[PDB]
């Protein structure tokens, strides 16, 4: 927006400076890990946990915190939901999209995400695994989605998982997959104990961006 | 509470409450009248709310500022005294 081009412009015009001595690192502090509060808060690299009234020299970011969004199927106890889960890496500035995929694959802790091969895409357009972030103008503000193999097959009832509400889960598939790990047959402590949302939550029509009545 | 009269639309159900609030157009009209009256009240009422808000803010401006006057003079006095004591030191 405004900030992005204001700051970009500032950087560009600061690099074209003929006469500059350079900063004095005695006067340019880092950040603290020691501050009041229980929680550990991670901030921007231009921001600090103390009050610094003076504006620091624009620096170029050598690690860009990319976000990569996946579709996930959550078990909500009335059936399946499809919602969004982000992975966040720190990708070196000049890195190749191939290498970004690799970073992503190493940084997800959910067993339900990276199972098959996937392609990174911005606004639906696939990206070259061959080229740099520099060419595609990826600023960390950019919206980057992630498209799996079977994802265009989801409109069917096959690839989309089958919930024990409406479908048989058989001795075939009780020993395999999320179905196994879930423990459908109720135990005393009630099993993994997932989140539940009831049937009448959204009314008769499910959640939409457009008001349907 | 919300008053449910006897001539409200009766519900015939054994599984729930005996009378649903639904109105004879008369009752609705009546309600509108009484409501208008009360509106006449709360107009003045919350008018007085924002009056007192500005009153209090203003009096705060004046008194707090006077306090900064006096206090700053104090603070300056103490600071003078201290650096004097350090010359002496």
């Amino acid at each position: 927006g405004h900030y992005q081009q204001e700051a970009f412009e500032a950087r560009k015009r600061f690099e074209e400076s003929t006469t500059y001595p350079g900063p004095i690192r005695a006067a340019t502090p880092g950040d603290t890990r020691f501050y009041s509060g229980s929680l550990e808060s991670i901030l921007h690299d231009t921001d600090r946990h103390y009050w610094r009234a003076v504006t620091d020299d624009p620096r170029v970011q050598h690690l860009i915190p990319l976000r990569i969004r996946f579709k996930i199927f959550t078990w909500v106890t009335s059936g399946w939901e499809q919602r969004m889960q982000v992975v966040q890496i720190m990708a070196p500035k000049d890195s190749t999209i191939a290498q970004v995929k690799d970073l992503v694959i190493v940084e997800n802790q959910s067993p339900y995400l990276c199972v098959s091969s996937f392609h990174l895409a911005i606004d639906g357009k696939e990206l070259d695994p061959q080229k740099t972030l520099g060419e595609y103008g990826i600023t960390e503000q950019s919206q980057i989605d992630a498209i799996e193999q079977n994802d265009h097959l989801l409109h069917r009832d096959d690839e989309r998982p089958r919930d024990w509400t409406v479908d048989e889960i058989t001795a075939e598939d009780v020993k395999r997959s999320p179905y196994k790990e879930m423990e459908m047959q109720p135990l005393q402590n009630l099993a993994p104990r997932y989140e539940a949302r009831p049937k009448g939550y959204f009314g008769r029509t499910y959640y939409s961006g457009m008001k349907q009545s | 509470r919300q008053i449910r009269p006897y001539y409200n639309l009766p519900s015939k159900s054994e599984h729930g409450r005996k009378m649903t609030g639904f109105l004879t157009p008369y009752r609705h009209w009546m309600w509108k009248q009484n409501e208008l009256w009360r509106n006449v009240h709360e107009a003045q009422f919350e008018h007085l709310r924002r009056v007192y808000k500005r009153q209090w803010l203003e009096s705060f401006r004046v008194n707090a500022d006077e306090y900064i006057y006096k206090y700053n003079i104090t603070k300056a006095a103490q600071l003078a005294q201290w650096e004097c004591e350090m010359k002496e030191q």
């Binding site: 350079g22 889960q85 966040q88 997800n108 | -």
Partner: protein
């Protein structure tokens, strides 16, 4: 069950995301403790950073404390090399030859036209700075990285005559870059971090070798002790690997 219910190390809020997001819209996962892992752990070091215009040009000459023969340093670095090559022989192009070991006290860009005037003047001012300083006994233990893990070096511990060094350096810094305007890669009002560069990855190499020296090599030597050394000799050098089996030397000063 083997510890705290929510381990305190796992409690992390990301404020670089957004106010409404993580409550409702989506949840963001990351391994957040790679980023939090600190300057002591990674082995990073904050060197005086160059202004952009100075950042563009290559350095030409540097100041160096010359290491004598029969060092503890050179010996132990040789042992370190052997150990490293036996572990991984991919290091072989990274490693600096034990003959080229020197301490780097500061780095500098000299234009080729005014060259003679500047070497004369520098050498003179340098001789004036160190006239009163007697030899320096410094301690070397620990490793650190410059340039995002591309340059791997031996630290100079401020436990010893190092103090004097810092004044000494900070004098030439204010002469060489302050007095006669010369490009020191940093600000002349700031002090350079003295170091012994051990392994390095140059721009040409970076394609076959990789973008960062993997920390698995030097992890175990990260805090290793290379010992004490006394230094009587200061040099101003132009960078050529060929001529003596050592860097081509444009000037010298004896500390005595």
């Amino acid at each position: 069950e083997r510890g705290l219910y929510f381990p305190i190390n796992h409690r992390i809020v990301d404020h670089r995301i957004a106010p409404g997001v993580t409550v409702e819209e989506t949840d963001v996962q990351s391994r957040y403790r790679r980023e939090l892992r600190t300057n002591f752990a990674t082995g990073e070091t904050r060197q005086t950073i160059a202004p952009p215009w100075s950042a563009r040009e290559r350095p030409t000459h540097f100041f160096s404390l010359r290491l004598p023969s029969r060092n503890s340093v050179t010996l132990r670095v040789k042992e370190m090399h052997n150990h490293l090559l036996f572990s991984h022989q991919q290091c072989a192009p990274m490693l600096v030859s034990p003959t080229k070991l020197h301490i780097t006290l500061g780095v500098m860009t000299i234009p080729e036209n005014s060259r003679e005037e500047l070497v004369k003047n520098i050498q003179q001012s340098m001789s004036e700075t160190f006239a009163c300083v007697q030899p320096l006994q410094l301690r070397f233990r620990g490793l650190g990285t410059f340039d995002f893990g591309r340059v791997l070096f031996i630290r100079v511990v401020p436990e010893a005559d190092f103090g004097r060094l810092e004044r000494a350096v900070c004098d030439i810094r204010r002469r060489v870059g302050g007095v006669l305007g010369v490009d020191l890669k940093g600000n002349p009002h700031d002090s350079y971090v003295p170091h012994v560069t051990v392994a390095k990855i140059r721009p040409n190499q970076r394609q076959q070798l990789g973008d960062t020296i993997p920390q698995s090599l030097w992890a175990d030597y990260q805090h290793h002790d290379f010992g004490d050394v006394t230094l009587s000799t200061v040099d101003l050098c132009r960078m050529k690997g060929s001529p003596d089996g050592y860097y081509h030397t444009e000037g010298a000063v004896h500390l005595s």
